[PDB]
Amino acid sequence: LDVPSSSRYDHRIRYVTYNPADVVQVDTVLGVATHIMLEEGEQYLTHAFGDSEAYAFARKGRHIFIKPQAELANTNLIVVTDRRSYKFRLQMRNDRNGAMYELAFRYPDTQAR
């Protein structure tokens, strides 16, 4: 389980180091739209939720927004592109605290290249 590490300024914005062998535990709360970005020039192929009506999905280029829409929405998101495949264990938080506004990636292989 890759738990995002938050920024030092506000713990609303978090970063995760991408990994083929692990999933991202996302703590989504009610009433917030959360922002996810891809690599530059990454072509989105398909996405598949465990529950299509539990979350709301709209994608623009390399930017992914997901939104809660139903109580007890605990499913997964598998958004796949040409470069790789993402895995998030979407979990609603009940108390509307410890939110996470935007998730960012740190890529080891690209940085090394």
């Binding site: 709301a56 999905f57 927004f65």
Partner: peptide, 26 residues
């Protein structure tokens, strides 16, 4: 996520007036 008579042909065609419009000084 997001919201939302007429004869005399030759002499009479040489008598057709030439009317040139006047000008105004600018």
């Amino acid at each position: 996520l997001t919201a939302g008579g007429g004869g005399g042909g030759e002499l009479a065609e040489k008598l057709q007036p030439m009317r040139l419009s006047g000008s105004s000084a600018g």
